[PDB]
Design an enzyme around this catalytic site. Structure first.
Site, PDB file in Angstrom:
ATOM      1  N   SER A 112      30.576  40.582  36.536  1.00 14.51           N
ATOM      2  CA  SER A 112      30.522  39.593  37.602  1.00 14.51           C
ATOM      3  C   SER A 112      29.438  38.578  37.267  1.00 14.51           C
ATOM      4  CB  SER A 112      30.242  40.255  38.950  1.00 14.51           C
ATOM      5  OG  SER A 112      29.750  39.315  39.888  1.00 14.51           O
ATOM      6  N   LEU A 113      29.843  37.322  37.068  1.00 18.23           N
ATOM      7  CA  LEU A 113      28.867  36.264  36.836  1.00 18.23           C
ATOM      8  C   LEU A 113      27.931  36.104  38.026  1.00 18.23           C
ATOM      9  CD1 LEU A 113      31.271  33.667  35.183  1.00 18.23           C
ATOM     10  CD2 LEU A 113      30.113  35.646  34.176  1.00 18.23           C
ATOM     11  N   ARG A 114      28.431  36.355  39.237  1.00 17.94           N
ATOM     12  CA  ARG A 114      27.590  36.255  40.424  1.00 17.94           C
ATOM     13  C   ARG A 114      26.537  37.357  40.450  1.00 17.94           C
ATOM     14  NH1 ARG A 114      27.771  39.509  44.748  1.00 17.94           N
ATOM     15  NH2 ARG A 114      29.675  40.446  43.877  1.00 17.94           N
ATOM     16  N   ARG A 115      26.904  38.571  40.031  1.00 17.68           N
ATOM     17  CA  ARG A 115      25.943  39.669  40.008  1.00 17.68           C
ATOM     18  C   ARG A 115      24.932  39.499  38.880  1.00 17.68           C
ATOM     19  NH1 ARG A 115      30.811  43.900  41.028  1.00 17.68           N
ATOM     20  NH2 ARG A 115      30.627  44.076  43.309  1.00 17.68           N
TER      21      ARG A 115
HETATM   22  C1  LIG Z   1      39.022  30.076  41.725  1.00 20.91           C
HETATM   23  C2  LIG Z   1      39.000  31.357  42.565  1.00 20.91           C
HETATM   24  N1  LIG Z   1      39.749  32.535  42.297  1.00 20.91           N
HETATM   25  C3  LIG Z   1      39.459  33.482  43.312  1.00 20.91           C
HETATM   26  C4  LIG Z   1      40.022  34.902  43.409  1.00 20.91           C
HETATM   27  C5  LIG Z   1      38.923  35.738  42.745  1.00 20.91           C
HETATM   28  N2  LIG Z   1      37.878  36.362  43.395  1.00 20.91           N
HETATM   29  C6  LIG Z   1      37.048  37.011  42.503  1.00 20.91           C
HETATM   30  C7  LIG Z   1      35.800  37.798  42.897  1.00 20.91           C
HETATM   31  C8  LIG Z   1      35.764  39.205  42.307  1.00 20.91           C
HETATM   32  N3  LIG Z   1      36.758  40.220  42.434  1.00 20.91           N
HETATM   33  C9  LIG Z   1      36.303  41.359  41.728  1.00 20.91           C
HETATM   34  C10 LIG Z   1      37.036  42.700  41.575  1.00 20.91           C
HETATM   35  C11 LIG Z   1      37.113  43.400  42.941  1.00 20.91           C
HETATM   36  N4  LIG Z   1      37.906  42.969  44.033  1.00 20.91           N
HETATM   37  C12 LIG Z   1      37.695  43.880  45.105  1.00 20.91           C
HETATM   38  C13 LIG Z   1      36.786  44.856  44.679  1.00 20.91           C
HETATM   39  C14 LIG Z   1      36.284  46.032  45.531  1.00 20.91           C
HETATM   40  C15 LIG Z   1      35.361  45.517  46.646  1.00 20.91           C
HETATM   41  C16 LIG Z   1      36.120  44.682  47.682  1.00 20.91           C
HETATM   42  O1  LIG Z   1      37.248  45.056  48.098  1.00 20.91           O
HETATM   43  O2  LIG Z   1      35.609  43.617  48.123  1.00 20.91           O
HETATM   44  C17 LIG Z   1      36.419  44.557  43.326  1.00 20.91           C
HETATM   45  C18 LIG Z   1      35.453  45.351  42.438  1.00 20.91           C
HETATM   46  C19 LIG Z   1      34.009  45.216  42.924  1.00 20.91           C
HETATM   47  O3  LIG Z   1      33.610  44.139  43.438  1.00 20.91           O
HETATM   48  O4  LIG Z   1      33.219  46.189  42.804  1.00 20.91           O
HETATM   49  C20 LIG Z   1      35.053  41.052  41.173  1.00 20.91           C
HETATM   50  C21 LIG Z   1      34.202  41.997  40.339  1.00 20.91           C
HETATM   51  C22 LIG Z   1      34.367  41.717  38.852  1.00 20.91           C
HETATM   52  C23 LIG Z   1      33.525  42.750  38.105  1.00 20.91           C
HETATM   53  O5  LIG Z   1      32.753  43.510  38.746  1.00 20.91           O
HETATM   54  O6  LIG Z   1      33.604  42.844  36.854  1.00 20.91           O
HETATM   55  C24 LIG Z   1      34.716  39.720  41.537  1.00 20.91           C
HETATM   56  C25 LIG Z   1      33.436  38.967  41.138  1.00 20.91           C
HETATM   57  C26 LIG Z   1      32.325  39.146  42.167  1.00 20.91           C
HETATM   58  O7  LIG Z   1      32.430  40.013  43.076  1.00 20.91           O
HETATM   59  O8  LIG Z   1      31.299  38.418  42.099  1.00 20.91           O
HETATM   60  C27 LIG Z   1      37.569  36.801  41.203  1.00 20.91           C
HETATM   61  C28 LIG Z   1      36.967  37.311  39.890  1.00 20.91           C
HETATM   62  C29 LIG Z   1      37.712  38.478  39.250  1.00 20.91           C
HETATM   63  C30 LIG Z   1      36.815  38.972  38.114  1.00 20.91           C
HETATM   64  O9  LIG Z   1      37.092  40.031  37.497  1.00 20.91           O
HETATM   65  O10 LIG Z   1      35.784  38.316  37.803  1.00 20.91           O
HETATM   66  C31 LIG Z   1      38.771  35.963  41.359  1.00 20.91           C
HETATM   67  C32 LIG Z   1      39.715  35.460  40.266  1.00 20.91           C
HETATM   68  C33 LIG Z   1      39.036  34.564  39.228  1.00 20.91           C
HETATM   69  O11 LIG Z   1      37.793  34.369  39.255  1.00 20.91           O
HETATM   70  O12 LIG Z   1      39.739  34.019  38.338  1.00 20.91           O
HETATM   71  C34 LIG Z   1      38.524  32.899  44.183  1.00 20.91           C
HETATM   72  C35 LIG Z   1      37.926  33.558  45.432  1.00 20.91           C
HETATM   73  C36 LIG Z   1      36.503  34.064  45.181  1.00 20.91           C
HETATM   74  C37 LIG Z   1      35.958  34.600  46.508  1.00 20.91           C
HETATM   75  O13 LIG Z   1      36.513  34.263  47.587  1.00 20.91           O
HETATM   76  O14 LIG Z   1      34.962  35.372  46.526  1.00 20.91           O
HETATM   77  C38 LIG Z   1      38.252  31.572  43.732  1.00 20.91           C
HETATM   78  C39 LIG Z   1      37.282  30.592  44.397  1.00 20.91           C
HETATM   79  C40 LIG Z   1      37.956  29.360  45.001  1.00 20.91           C
HETATM   80  O15 LIG Z   1      39.098  29.443  45.526  1.00 20.91           O
HETATM   81  O16 LIG Z   1      37.349  28.256  44.981  1.00 20.91           O
END
Ligand SMILES: *Cc1[nH]c(Cc2[nH]c(Cc3[nH]c(Cc4[nH]cc(CCC(=O)O)c4CC(=O)O)c(CCC(=O)O)c3CC(=O)O)c(CCC(=O)O)c2CC(=O)O)c(CCC(=O)O)c1CC(=O)O
Length: 323
Positions: A112-115
Site C-alpha cells: 500500500s503506497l498510502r501505508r
Molecule cells: C483510481 C481508484 N481506484 C480505486 C479502487 C481501489 N481502492 C484501493 C485501496 C486498497 N484496496 C486494498 C486491498 C483490500 N481491500 C479491502 C481489504 C480489507 C479491508 C477492507 O475491507 O477495507 C483489503 C486488504 C487490506 O487493506 O488489508 C488495498 C491494500 C493493498 C495492499 O495492502 O497491498 C488498498 C490500498 C490501501 O488500503 O491504501 C485500490 C488499490 C488496490 C491495491 O492493491 O493497491 C484500488 C484500485 C487501484 O488503485 O488501482 C479507488 C478508490 C480508493 C479508495 O476509495 O480508497 C480510486 C480512487 C479514485 O476513484 O479517485
C-alpha cells in the site's frame, strides 16, 4: 423473483457477502437469496453480470470502489462500518513488540503506497518493502521465512476471517490514517432498479453513510488518480462531523494534512426520497434525508480545496509519476 447475489471466489469476498446476506435475511425472512460465485481491476467483471441481469447486487469493500462508478451502477447500501484502522502482524519471535520497539532495519511488508508513505515518515528506522500475495500467503511468508519482521494490513479483514488474535498492534490516526472508506462494505446495484434499491436501502447506516460521503467527496475532488498516498479520518461527535485528510509523497517526507468540521445532524427517521435525485460520489440513499448527505459532500470538497491551495496537487503528481 429470486434475489441473486454475485460474489468473487476469494475467501474474504465470500465472507463479506455472507455477512451482508445475513443482515438482509433478518429484515426479509420471507425472501430467498441465492449467492453466485464468479470469476488489476475485478469490479468490472461483477459489473458486467450486474448490467446483464445475471445478478442483482454485488458486495464490495468500499475502498475498492473508485469515486466514479460507471453510469449504470450505484452503491445502494453503505453498511455499518467495522474497525477502520490499520493493524500490524508481527513475526512469531517478535510477539509483544511494536513498530517503535522493533530493532532498526527490520523489514515491514506492505504493498500500500498510502501505508508505506505514512509509516516511513513516522518510523524512519524500519524498511518498508512490498509484500505479495493474499492474506493467507502473506501470513505464511511472515511465519516461515525470516525476511519480514512484520506485515501491514487492515484490521477488518483479519476480524472477518476470525483471526483477531494475530493482531499485534492497532495503528492510531497519528501513526497511520486509514484509506477512504476502509472498514465499510458497499452494496453495488443497477442504478435504475427501483426494487433492489429499495430492498438494500435497509442496510444503510446513517453515520457510516455520511462519513463515507465526506471521505469519497474529499478523495474525488483531489483527482489524484489510482494508487496515490491519500488517507482520511472521520468522526461524528456532538452533532459535528469531523474530517481530517492528508496527502504524502511516496517516501513520506512531503505531507499536507488539515482538519475541518461542519454541523451535520445524524438522521434517525427514514423518508420516501425522490426518485430522480443524482448520486453522491456514486452513492444512492433515497431513504436517508438528503440535506445532511449534501452537507457531508460539501465538507469533503471544502477540505480538498483547502489542501489544494496549500500545494496538494504537486505532491499527488510526483507520487503518481513515481509509482
Ligand atoms: C483510481 C481508484 N481506484 C480505486 C479502487 C481501489 N481502492 C484501493 C485501496 C486498497 N484496496 C486494498 C486491498 C483490500 N481491500 C479491502 C481489504 C480489507 C479491508 C477492507 O475491507 O477495507 C483489503 C486488504 C487490506 O487493506 O488489508 C488495498 C491494500 C493493498 C495492499 O495492502 O497491498 C488498498 C490500498 C490501501 O488500503 O491504501 C485500490 C488499490 C488496490 C491495491 O492493491 O493497491 C484500488 C484500485 C487501484 O488503485 O488501482 C479507488 C478508490 C480508493 C479508495 O476509495 O480508497 C480510486 C480512487 C479514485 O476513484 O479517485
Amino acid at each position: 423473483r429470486v434475489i441473486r447475489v454475485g460474489t468473487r471466489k476469494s475467501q474474504l469476498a465470500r465472507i463479506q457477502t455472507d455477512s451482508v446476506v445475513a443482515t438482509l435475511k433478518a429484515s426479509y425472512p420471507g425472501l430467498q437469496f441465492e449467492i453466485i460465485a464468479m470469476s488489476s481491476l475485478f469490479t468490472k467483471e461483477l459489473e458486467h453480470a450486474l448490467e446483464k441481469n445475471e445478478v442483482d447486487l454485488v458486495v464490495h469493500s468500499l475502498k475498492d470502489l473508485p469515486t466514479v462508478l460507471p453510469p449504470g451502477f450505484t452503491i445502494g447500501a453503505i453498511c455499518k462500518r467495522e474497525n477502520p484502522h490499520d493493524a500490524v502482524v508481527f513475526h512469531p519471535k517478535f510477539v509483544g513488540k511494536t513498530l517503535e520497539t522493533l530493532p532498526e532495519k527490520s523489514v515491514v511488508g506492505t504493498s500500500s503506497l498510502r501505508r508505506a508513505a505514512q509509516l516511513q515518515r513516522k518510523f524512519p528506522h524500519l524498511e518498508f518493502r512490498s509484500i505479495r500475495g493474499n492474506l493467507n500467503t502473506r501470513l505464511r511468508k511472515l511465519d516461515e521465512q525470516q525476511e519480514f519482521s512484520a506485515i501491514i494490513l487492515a484490521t477488518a479483514g483479519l476480524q472477518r476471517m476470525g483471526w483477531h488474535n494475530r493482531v499485534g498492534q492497532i495503528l492510531h490516526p497519528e501513526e497511520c490514517m486509514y484509506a477512504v472508506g476502509q472498514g465499510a462494505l458497499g452494496v453495488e446495484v443497477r442504478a435504475k432498479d427501483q426494487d433492489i434499491l429499495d430492498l438494500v436501502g435497509v442496510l444503510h447506516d446513517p453515520e457510516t453513510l455520511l462519513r463515507c460521503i465526506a471521505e469519497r467527496a474529499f478523495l474525488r475532488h483531489l483527482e489524484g488518480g489510482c494508487s496515490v498516498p491519500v488517507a482520511v479520518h472521520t468522526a461524528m461527535k456532538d452533532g459535528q462531523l469531523y474530517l481530517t485528510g492528508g496527502v504524502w509523497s511516496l517516501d513520506g517526507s512531503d505531507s499536507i494534512q488539515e482538519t475541518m468540521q461542519a454541523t451535520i445532524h445524524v438522521p434517525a427517521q427514514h423518508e420516501d426520497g425522490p426518485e430522480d435525485d443524482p448520486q453522491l460520489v456514486g452513492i444512492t440513499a433515497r431513504n436517508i434525508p438528503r440535506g445532511p448527505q449534501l452537507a457531508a459532500q460539501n465538507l469533503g470538497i471544502s477540505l480538498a480545496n483547502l489542501l489544494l491551495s496549500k500545494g496538494a496537487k504537486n505532491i499527488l503528481d510526483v507520487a503518481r509519476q513515481l509509482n
